[PDB]
Amino acid sequence: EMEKEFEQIDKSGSWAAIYQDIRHEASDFPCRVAKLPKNKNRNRYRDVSPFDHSRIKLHQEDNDYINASLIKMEEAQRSYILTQGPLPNTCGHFWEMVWEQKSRGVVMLNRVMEKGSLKCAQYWPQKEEKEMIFEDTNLKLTLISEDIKSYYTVRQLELENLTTQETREILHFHYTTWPDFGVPESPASFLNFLFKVRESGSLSPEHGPVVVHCSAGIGRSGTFCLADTCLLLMDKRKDPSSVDIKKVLLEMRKFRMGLIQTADQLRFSYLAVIEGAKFIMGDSSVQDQWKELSHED
Ligand SMILES: [Mg+2]
Ligand SMILES: [Mg+2]
């Protein structure tokens, strides 16, 4: 069981060993499209690229490249799109992807302004009366409403394809207090956030894959999806103790590199899954318990 596994790993102080083993066994696939000279300004980081086999392709003739990967978890029956924080020149591409992939939600785990440097562009409207128009992709984005909490904000946006004038409601879940290469304040606050995303219906199979991003789209976003997928698996299998989080992470790493960037993020993932299991195994009391422990605004 992960409960006992966590315990032994924690007692012996071997998180660095398990994490390094994961990095060592992680899949290696080519990223030739991402490294093409013409795509240099579409990547935020030189060392973070999507594999060619799982990258999301924009439905356009000019250039179909966007630093985004489709994570398809077969057993868990859920897919996620992990991408970098949009750049000033890829904001239109980002929303084009959301439209073409039919996503209902966008999960943001970073802040536009991190440790001084801008790890992400302001790709959504901050005011209702100031909508955004992405000329290159012919899309319009309007802020409909926003619910601000102490450590996260939920926004309701309207995305319109200016070509067909059809519109769609997109839910934006922004976790505002998760540092780069850091962890959430507590398993409770993280789980409260995750379950808010689940309850919104954004992760339903009737919609396209949820779009999850942070700065590079691998550390924080990897942690988020790993925890969700593991909880999903525990709920499906006849044996909830059969879930090997290390194995699930490696499966996820077949679709995008570097998911989960620190030994501590790995440790936290265990904690989130362990605590979350309490809700999955009945006892729907923990649900409201996390809400209280997270001290929302
Ligand atoms: Mg106002
Ligand atoms: Mg309002």
UniProtKB/Swiss-Prot annotation:
Annotated EC: 3.1.3.48
Main location: endoplasmic reticulum
Coiled coil residues, start to end: none
Gene Ontology cellular-component annotations: cytoplasm; cytoplasmic side of endoplasmic reticulum membrane; cytosol; early endosome; endoplasmic reticulum; endosome lumen; glutamatergic synapse; mitochondrial crista
S-nitrosocysteine: residues bearing it: 214
Binding site for substrate: 180, 214-220, 261
Residues recorded with modification Cysteine sulfenic acid (-SOH): 214
Cross-link (N,N-(cysteine-1,S-diyl)serine (Cys-Ser)): 214-215
Subunit and partners: Interacts with EPHA3 (phosphorylated); dephosphorylates EPHA3 and may regulate its trafficking and function. Interacts with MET. Interacts with NCK1.
Record's protein name: Tyrosine-protein phosphatase non-receptor type 1
Species assigned in the record: Homo sapiens (Human)
